[PDB]
Structures are given as structure tokens and as C-alpha cells.
């Protein structure tokens, strides 16, 4: 088994391999002492490291290269009168859970009256939550602006591109299945990086799936035409094919017109879309089974690191309150503009759908890394550790804006998290067939 | 082999054969033959021709230690504006890469660190931009002013 003291210390070393680890450490020590600073520079900049917690594999890779639950809360000083706000809000939630409606309405009015005189992000989140509670009582551009004013989508896109590119080395025919095409702001970077590779850009096939058009439009066609024009301007082959579907449970491995895997690699992408499917019983297992039938080489998953699928209403309400108050706090240094206001509207719709709605209509059921891990590992899927290059690119991304203040990136168990200081917010990971 | 060069005014200069190959235009003329009398250079001043003659002669003599040439070409550039411009034009005309490189490096060094105020005083040029376009270009390069 594992050494207990090392395990709590934060390292994964087997008890039966301690002597081997020490011997490898001493050999690495002598090898580094033999070489000059050139070897140190080579390991500092040229090489990459995977899964630093596994000391055995990390040391072996270094030797080969040299010689070829849990809840997190952060408090903010700007809570002079917020204590009464949380008191009233939790009282209203409990009263809602206690089949009492008149008290809930009175408490909603009290929250409104108290938030009238408040000044801060507390005011905004309290107003949105009060509106959500009013909607619950009564029943008893978005993404572009969010992308432009928040770093979540950019970080997710760049980490996904790095993972896919690292998984697409030494291949001549590639194919990408995207479960959320959206606006296609991620693929230009991937195609530009694949154009400047070492060996020549291979054939690039893209198959996208998106939600049905509310106004019966051809957004997928426009995105495909734009991407084809960009590919022509970059001199890379490109085949595009767009699909319309209400949910991912109706897909099939034979309806995608998949070419044989022995002659072409397949990569599946997903960004903030796998949690909208947990509301329907049995859908996620079928989607994972069809992914297994696809037999891809990589599966990129980006989610929000918070538990919002609890059976108890009050628990979900509390943790969602704290997560969204942290989110609204993290958006105070951004200067005022229409983008900021419209993204607060986006987050308000987020809160309203998460709180007021119930049943299969509610699609906003997030989960943390652990449960996703057991869900993926029940179908024969193994993890795939990311490297330090993605970490560094994410660091530069977060350093482009606000002088790199507040938001931090961390690694754990082969996955990356972007968060406000020490509070994880977004988790990105990669999986493969076992 | 001795080569006679004739200037615009009428002065005659005597040059050698190995130095002639330094000017690749003269070498290209030579490999095509059809050269018996002195090659005339119409649009070239005599003193500039003498200066470039001294430069090329010194360079070939030194080539046949780096600090010595660095100091020599440093001492060469003790000429004013007019001689510098004439030498640049001559180096363009007879196409000597080293002399042109040195003159352009010297002029780039003396324009380094200047402002849109200092350059106009340095070269005595006329500012032909209207206040609107001048403000526009200043705003475009406003990062350079902080």
C-alpha cells in the first residue's frame, strides 16, 4: 500500500519501492552533479513533467531525459451588513422547505428592503437570489460577452487545445467530434498550431453538434463557412459537417458516419455541456457507452468544481449561494461596460434556473472531480495526465488581464483547476480508453 | 593592372586591380569584357570618389586586429551632413555594401533617442501634417511617449 505519512504530506510512494526510489534519487543526484548548468537549463525549459505526485515515474522520466466531502469558504471584509442578509436569506430558504409561503413572501420583502440600502456585489447576488425565490414561490450575446469579460472559457479552450494537440502527434488523419460547437472560438487556435507543426499539417475533419436553433437559423452553417475560409487562408485541408440535436442521448455510433479508427484518430471534446445531461435518468451512461463505442484517443472534459446535485434543497441552496457570491466578488475589479452588465445578466439567469426550476427542466447540476471520476471509471475509462506546458500557458493567459491578480491555476491528480485564490472554480481533465 | 577613373568635373584617379573587384558592379562589367578605356562615372562628385577610394584601399590593405578597423572606421565618420549624404548616395550608386552599412548605422545612431521635435531640427524638414492627422498619429503611438 501507500506510505501514510507521505500520503498526507502530498506524495504517492509505495511502501515496497522506497529503496528503489532512494537509489533513483541518488543516481539522479550524481548525474546532475556530473553535468553543468546546461543540463539544468534543459530540464528547466525543454522538458515537460507529468503527474509530479508519482515520484517513481517522475524520477524515471528525469533519468531518461538527462541521459538519453470538502467545502471551501473565503470571507470578504465587505460584509458590514451582509450578515443580516444571509440570516434573512437562509431563513427564507428554510421556510420554503417548511411548506410555509406567507413567511417566505414576508422574508423576500425584507431582503428587498435591506438590499435597497446596500452597496456591493452582495447587493447584486442578493437581488438575483430574491428574484429566484420569488419565482420559486410563484410556481409553488450572452456567451459572447461572458467569453469577452471572463477568463473561464478562454482557459478551458486553451487547455483543451493543448491536450488535443499533445494527443495528435505522429498522426496523418485526424477527426474531431465536438459536443458543444457554440461559436467555434476554440478551433482557430488548434488549426493554427497544427499548421505550424513539425511534419506537415494533416487532414482535419470536424463534426459539430449544437442545440436546436430557437429562431430556425443556420448558425452552424455560418461557423463552418467561416472556419473553412480561415483554413483556406492558412493552407490546411478541412471538411466540416454540422448537426442539430436536442440532447446527446439520441446520438449513435453508426449515425456519425465514422471512418475506421485504424486509419484515422478520433478526439471528443466537451466544454460545460456534460452537466446539462445529468437531469435525465440513464442518459449519461448511454452517452459514455457511445463514446466507448467510438473508441477515441482522448476525451477532454471541462466542468465547474462544485456539488449542486444534492437531494436536499437547503444544502444545494447554501453551497450555490456561496459559490455565486464568490463569483460575483471576483468580478469587482473589472471596469464598467455593457459587457460586464450583460455577463451579470448571464449569471443571474444561471442562478434563477439553478434555484427556481426543478425536475428534468433543471439542467444546472454540477459535480466535483471525485464523482465524475467514479462515473468515468465505471465504463472502462482511464485518466490522462496533462503537462506543465498547459499550466504555463494558463498562467500567461491569467497574466494578460488585471496584471495577473486574484485568479490562480493549480494542478492535482493529473487535472487542472482555475480558481479565485484558493477556491477552485473550473476543473479541466483528459481521459482515454483503458 | 592599373585602372583610370574619370570624375564629373574632369579629375583623373589611378586605382589598382584587386580593389576593383571590391565593387561588384565593376566586376560584373569586367567579366563581360568590352572595357579598354577609362570607365566614366557621370553623376559622382570628385571628392566623394577620393574618399571612397581611400576607404576601399584601406579596407583591402587591412584585410590582406578587428579593433584596428573599428577605430579606423570610427575616425572616418568625422564628416558633416553634406559629406555623409553624398557618401550615402555614392555607396548606393556604385553599390558597396560595407560603406552603405556603415553610413546607415552612423545615421541610425545619431537619430536614436530622438523625438518628433528633435528629428525636424536635426534634418531641417517640413512638417506637412495637419493638426487632426498629427493628433491621430500621436495617439496611435502614444505608448512610446510614456
Amino acid at each position: 500500500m501507500d506510505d501514510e505519512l507521505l500520503a498526507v504530506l502530498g506524495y504517492k510512494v509505495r511502501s515496497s519501492e522506497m529503496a528503489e526510489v532512494a537509489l533513483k534519487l541518488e543516481q539522479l543526484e550524481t548525474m546532475m552533479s556530473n553535468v553543468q548548468e546546461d543540463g539544468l537549463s534543459h530540464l528547466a525549459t525543454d522538458t515537460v513533467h507529468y503527474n509530479p505526485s508519482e515520484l517513481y515515474s517522475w524520477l524515471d522520466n528525469m533519468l531518461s531525459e538527462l541521459n538519453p466531502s470538502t467545502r471551501s469558504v473565503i470571507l470578504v471584509d465587505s460584509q458590514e451588513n451582509g450578515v443580516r442578509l444571509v440570516h434573512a436569506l437562509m431563513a427564507c430558504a428554510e421556510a420554503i422547505q417548511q411548506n410555509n409561503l406567507t413567511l417566505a413572501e414576508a422574508l423576500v420583502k425584507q431582503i428587498g428592503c435591506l438590499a435597497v440600502s446596500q452597496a456591493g456585489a452582495m447587493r447584486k447576488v442578493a437581488t438575483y437570489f430574491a428574484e429566484a425565490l420569488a419565482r420559486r414561490i410563484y410556481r409553488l450575446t450572452l456567451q459572447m460577452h461572458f467569453y469577452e469579460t471572463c477568463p473561464y472559457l478562454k482557459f478551458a479552450h486553451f487547455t483543451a487545445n493543448q491536450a488535443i494537440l499533445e494527443a495528435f502527434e505522429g498522426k496523418k488523419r485526424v477527426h474531431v467530434i465536438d459536443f458543444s460547437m457554440n461559436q467555434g472560438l476554440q478551433w482557430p487556435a488548434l488549426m493554427q498550431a497544427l499548421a505550424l507543426r513539425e511534419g506537415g499539417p494533416p487532414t482535419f475533419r470536424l463534426t459539430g453538434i449544437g442545440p436546436p436553433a430557437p429562431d430556425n437559423s443556420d448558425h452552424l452553417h455560418e461557423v463552418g463557412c467561416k472556419l473553412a475560409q480561415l483554413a483556406e487562408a492558412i493552407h490546411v485541408e478541412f471538411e466540416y459537417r454540422g448537426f442539430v440535436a436536442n440532447s446527446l442521448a439520441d446520438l449513435d455510433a453508426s449515425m456519425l458516419e465514422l471512418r475506421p479508427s485504424d486509419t484515422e484518430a478520433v478526439a471528443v471534446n466537451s466544454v460545460f455541456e456534460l452537466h446539462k445531461l445529468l437531469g435525465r435518468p440513464g442518459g449519461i451512461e448511454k452517452v459514455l457507452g457511445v463514446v466507448k463505442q467510438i473508441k477515441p484517443v482522448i476525451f477532454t472534459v471541462v466542468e465547474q468544481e462544485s456539488n449542486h446535485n444534492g437531494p436536499v434543497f437547503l444544502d444545494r441552496f447554501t453551497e450555490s449561494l456561496h459559490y455565486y457570491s464568490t463569483l460575483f466578488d471576483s468580478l469587482e475589479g473589472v471596469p464598467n461596460s455593457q459587457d460586464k452588465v450583460m455577463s451579470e445578466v448571464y449569471l443571474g439567469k444561471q442562478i434563477c434556473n439553478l434555484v427556481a426550476c426543478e425536475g428534468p427542466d433543471r439542467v444546472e447540476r454540477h459535480e466535483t472531480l471525485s464523482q465524475w471520476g467514479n462515473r468515468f471509471g465505471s465504463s472502462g475509462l482511464a485518466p490522462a495526465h496533462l503537462g506543465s506546458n498547459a499550466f504555463k500557458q494558463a498562467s500567461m493567459l491569467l497574466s494578460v488581464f488585471n496584471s495577473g491578480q486574484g485568479y490562480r491555476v493549480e494542478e492535482s491528480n493529473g487535472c487542472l483547476m482555475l480558481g479565485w485564490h484558493t477556491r477552485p472554480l473550473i476543473t479541466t481533465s483528459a481521459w482515454k480508453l483503458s | 593592372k592599373k585602372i583610370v577613373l574619370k570624375s564629373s568635373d574632369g579629375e583623373s584617379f589611378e586605382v589598382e586591380e584587386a580593389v576593383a573587384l571590391e565593387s561588384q558592379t565593376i566586376a560584373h562589367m569586367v567579366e563581360d569584357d568590352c572595357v579598354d578605356n577609362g570607365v566614366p562615372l557621370p553623376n559622382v562628385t570628385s571628392k566623394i570618389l577620393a574618399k571612397v577610394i581611400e576607404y576601399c584601399k584601406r579596407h583591402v590593405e587591412a584585410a590582406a586586429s578587428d579593433d584596428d578597423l573599428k577605430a579606423w572606421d570610427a575616425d572616418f565618420m568625422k564628416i558633416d551632413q553634406a559629406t555623409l549624404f553624398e557618401l550615402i548616395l555614392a555607396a548606393n550608386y556604385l553599390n558597396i555594401k560595407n560603406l552603405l552599412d556603415l553610413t546607415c548605422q552612423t545615421v541610425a545612431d545619431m537619430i536614436k533617442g530622438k523625438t518628433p521635435e528633435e528629428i525636424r531640427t536635426t534634418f531641417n524638414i517640413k512638417n506637412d501634417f495637419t493638426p487632426e492627422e498629427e493628433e491621430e498619429v500621436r495617439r496611435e503611438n502614444q505608448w512610446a511617449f510614456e
Partner: protein
């Protein structure tokens, strides 16, 4: 071969891995490879749910400089359910409760408040001491040189002193003990010296292998050079990345008992407990600091460790860990 006989296998492996990782990372120019350092570091997250009688949460004290700190306090006996977010700032119960303001090491350029090793150390301190612990996250050199860390510590101390939920019935004041390890010892000493002439009364200091230096090489650096996981080159590199450019190791931040430094005699300074590891290269400087404190007229207790190396307080599988913890508990609960 000498190191494998003094410390157990697990501590040897851990310290060797740390030394190798920091060695692949040091730059002769003076720059710091921050990104790979952050990637290789192991961190943890706060857990408000009590785990073995200890829970934790983060507080953002300052926003201009992103000054953050983590608070550990014992589990509530009267609350069977896990404490709520509103219950996090509950006033303390007990006639006298001490709070420990803790500073971590890393030669001013490594580790963080939310690092796994210091999280475990603070949890064990809370469990054995039965006290509240505040771990400060100060800025790290060389991107943020002197005097950023002292300002961060001063702001954290002012924040801790001004709280109303960490108070005592007996005298209506706060019982603050400053503690630090490695670089934290220097930070704690400087903050205590600053606060002595400011109004905030400090109860005691707990220094675990304090970091102090000078130009004159001592008799312990030569014999122990590179034999117990610590060499001299790293010492000069770290001291160069800290002090202002164009300064030697006789700066007051490097050597408090320097001709340019202020004399401690005639000034207020709390009692201190200095723990010195014998088999470390900076033993002589630590002993010199202890004797300077003794000669200045301030109370100081020396705990000379005969056969202990650096990082002896990271695993409980040795015998000196228990002695140090017992001595600290006796020192604070006096």
C-alpha cells in the same frame, strides 16, 4: 551515505526530492522559474467540515496586495453538525485562549500558506496546542524583494489584533504568539521588533531553525558542506535574491546584531523559544543569535538538538518532534 544513518528513510526521500526539485530550478542569472515551481508544488484546500477535530477557512485581509490568510480552530463541541459559514466567526469560548500567528519557510522564495506540509503542521499545532492558528501568505522574492514580507506580516498582525471574535473574557484583550520556521523565524523576529515600539503587545516568539547570516564564514559551514541536504551556494543565492541589489549580508535583515542595527537593550521584546538543529550548516548563526538575545537582557530558552537535521518537524516518526511539541505546549499554556 552520512545522511542515510541520521534520519529515517521517509524523511530522507522527502528532503532529497525537495533538494533535487529545487536544484533543477535554480538559475545562475538570478531569475526565478515561477511556473514550474507552482506546477511541482503540492497544495491543499480548506475544509469547513471538521476533520479529526480541526476545520479551516480562508480570509482575504487585503485586496490591494492580495494579502490572504488561513485560520484553523478546533471543532465545536456544542454543535454536532458541521459549523456553518455564519458560524465560522463564532466568538471563542474559554477564559484564556492563545492565537498563534504562524510564518512558513522556503527561504522567502518557496512554498505557500496553503501548502500541504504547512497545512499539516498547522493542523497538528492546533490539535496538540488546543489553540487558534493563523497562517499568513506573504509575498515571495525575487519578484517582490525586501521589505514586502515584513509589511505583509505587520498587516496580518494588525488584522488579528483588531478582531472581536478572537478575544478573552479575563482581560478583554487578545493573546497573540508569533511563530515562524526557517524564513518565518526572521519574519516573526522583524514583526515582533516592529510591534514592540508600536502599541501591540506580543506574548511570545517561537522560532524553528531561524535564518540569519553574515559575511564571515563560521566553523560549521565548512565541515557540513553538502553532507546533510544543505550546501552553501544556495544560501548566497537566496540571500542575494532577497536583499536590495548592491548590498552585502551585513544588512540588518540578514544580521540583527550588526553595527548598523539598533540595540535590543532598553527596548521591549517578548520572551522567545529558539529551536536549533545541530547537524545543520547555519547552526553557528542560530547560536550566535540566541547568545545575543541572552546578552541583550531579554528572556530566551535554548533547545539545542544534538542529532537533528533540517525539516525534523515534518514527520512524527522521529523522537524530537514530540519533545518540540511538548515544549511549545508548555511555553504557550504557561
Amino acid at each position: 551515505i552520512e545522511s542515510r544513518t541520521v534520519v529515517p528513510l521517509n524523511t530522507w526521500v522527502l528532503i532529497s526530492n525537495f533538494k533535487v526539485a529545487y536544484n533543477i530550478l535554480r538559475r545562475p542569472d538570478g531569475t526565478f522559474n515561477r511556473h514550474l515551481a507552482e506546477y511541482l508544488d503540492r497544495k491543499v484546500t480548506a475544509n469547513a467540515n471538521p476533520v479529526d477535530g480541526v476545520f479551516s477557512f480562508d480570509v482575504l485581509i487585503d485586496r490591494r496586495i492580495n494579502l490572504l490568510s488561513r485560520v484553523y480552530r478546533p471543532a465545536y463541541a456544542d454543535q454536532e453538525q458541521p459549523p456553518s459559514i455564519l458560524d465560522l466567526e463564532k466568538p471563542v469560548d474559554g477564559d484564556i485562549v492563545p492565537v498563534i500567528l504562524f510564518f512558513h519557510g522556503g527561504s522567502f522564495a518557496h512554498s505557500s500558506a496553503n501548502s500541504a506540509i504547512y497545512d499539516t503542521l498547522c493542523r497538528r499545532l492546533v490539535g496538540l496546542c488546543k489553540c487558534v492558528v493563523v497562517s499568513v501568505n506573504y509575498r515571495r522574492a525575487p519578484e517582490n524583494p525586501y521589505p514586502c514580507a515584513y509589511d505583509d506580516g505587520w498587516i496580518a498582525l494588525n488584522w488579528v489584533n483588531s478582531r472581536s471574535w478572537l478575544k478573552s473574557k479575563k482581560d478583554s484583550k487578545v493573546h497573540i504568539f508569533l511563530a515562524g520556521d526557517s524564513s518565518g523565524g526572521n519574519i516573526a523576529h522583524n514583526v515582533a521588533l516592529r510591534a514592540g515600539e508600536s502599541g501591540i503587545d506580543v506574548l511570545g516568539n517561537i522560532l524553528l531553525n531561524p535564518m540569519f547570516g553574515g559575511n564571515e564564514r563560521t566553523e560549521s559551514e565548512k565541515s557540513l558542506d553538502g553532507k546533510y541536504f544543505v550546501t552553501v551556494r544556495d544560501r548566497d543565492w537566496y540571500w542575494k535574491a532577497f536583499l536590495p541589489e548592491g548590498e552585502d549580508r551585513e544588512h540588518p535583515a540578514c544580521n540583527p546584531f550588526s553595527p548598523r542595527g539598533k540595540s535590543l537593550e532598553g527596548v521591549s521584546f517578548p520572551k522567545s523559544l529558539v529551536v536549533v538543529a545541530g547537524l545543520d550548516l547555519i547552526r553557528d548563526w542560530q547560536l550566535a543569535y540566541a547568545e545575543g538575545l541572552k546578552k541583550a537582557g531579554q528572556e530566551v530558552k535554548l533547545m539545542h538538538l544534538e542529532k537533528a537535521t533540517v525539516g525534523f518537524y515534518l514527520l512524527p516518526n522521529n523522537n524530537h518532534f514530540h519533545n518540540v511539541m511538548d515544549e511549545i505546549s508548555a511555553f504557550v499554556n504557561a
